[PDB]
């Protein structure tokens, strides 16, 4: 029962196909639910449970916020281009923020900013200061600190408003967050150069956390297994694969161990 809400902001100075000038995506537990970009300029849903939101002004209020954010980031890109003494060109401004609600009821919050794909400035919300990565970022560290307003405000947002919406979201998203979808496993083999390569693929499991293991007679072959990263399906489920190079002789000694919440016991899978 832990849960997270996170918003991801991307602002670029030169857009390209697929990359609007400004984009904001809201994620509930790593699944998307709201979208806004600078070409349609309206907030729109990305998950059907957002229709349960009872606040009438929700979509119009959040649209205006997003329209604020794109105006301000255009200005931020310009400020940072002068500060770092850069030419006009392709440039990137990014921001992540949100809150977590842990199992015991405690909460965490974050607000991180990045320029040109490197860290820039990040909120330390429990000392109300910012960490700066740069001398350029220290100029911002000083402005927000000497004015002394912004860290206290975001801290209030993260610890309060953000957590109130998360509880509401978690309740609306109950069916989708709690579902369990079993992985569908297939094991494949390939002998090349008197070396047999065994491949395990888990298709369509939900939720995201999974452990996939290659076992020689029930023993983990940890430093011999090469596994992929957890990758998303188009329906909100996940995918993962793990391969193992073996001697063609030892062949029925190998089992793929899939460990996931959908299975009461880890699934054992042979070729």
């Amino acid at each position: 029962e832990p849960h997270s809400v996170r918003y991801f902001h991307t602002a670029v100075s030169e857009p390209s196909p697929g990359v609007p000038q400004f984009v904001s995506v809201g994620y509930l537990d790593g699944e998307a639910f709201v979208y806004y970009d600078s070409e349609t300029r309206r907030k729109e849903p990305r998950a059907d449970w957002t229709s349960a939101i009872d606040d009438q002004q929700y979509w119009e209020r959040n649209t205006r916020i997003s329209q604020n954010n794109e105006q301000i980031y255009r200005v931020n890109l310009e400020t940072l281009r002068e500060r770092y003494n850069q030419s006009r060109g392709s440039h990137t401004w990014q921001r992540m923020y949100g809150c977590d609600l842990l199992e015991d009821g405690s909460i965490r919050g974050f607000d991180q900013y990045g320029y040109e794909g490197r860290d820039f400035i990040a909120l330390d919300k429990d000392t109300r200061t910012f960490t700066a990565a740069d001398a350029g970022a220290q100029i911002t560290k000083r402005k927000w600190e000497e004015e002394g307003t912004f860290a206290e405000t975001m801290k209030f947002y993260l610890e309060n408003t953000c957590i109130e919406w998360l509880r509401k979201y978690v309740s609306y998203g109950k069916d989708v967050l709690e579902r369990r979808e079993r992985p569908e496993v297939r094991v494949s083999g390939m002998e090349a150069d008197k070396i047999l390569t065994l491949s395990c693929r888990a298709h369509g499991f939900y939720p995201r956390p999974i452990s996939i293991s290659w076992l020689k007679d029930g023993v983990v072959q940890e430093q011999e297994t090469q596994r992929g990263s957890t990758v998303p399906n188009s329906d909100g489920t996940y995918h993962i694969w793990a391969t193992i190079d073996v001697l063609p002789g030892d062949r029925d000694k190998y089992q793929c161990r899939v460990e996931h919440a959908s299975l009461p016991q880890p699934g054992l899978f042979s070729w």
């Binding site: 904001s24 809201g26 916020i65 975001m154 947002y157």
Partner: peptide
């Protein structure tokens, strides 16, 4: 819901 306060560098 997103934060109302703006982030001016």
């Amino acid at each position: 819901a997103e934060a109302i306060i703006v982030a001016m560098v």
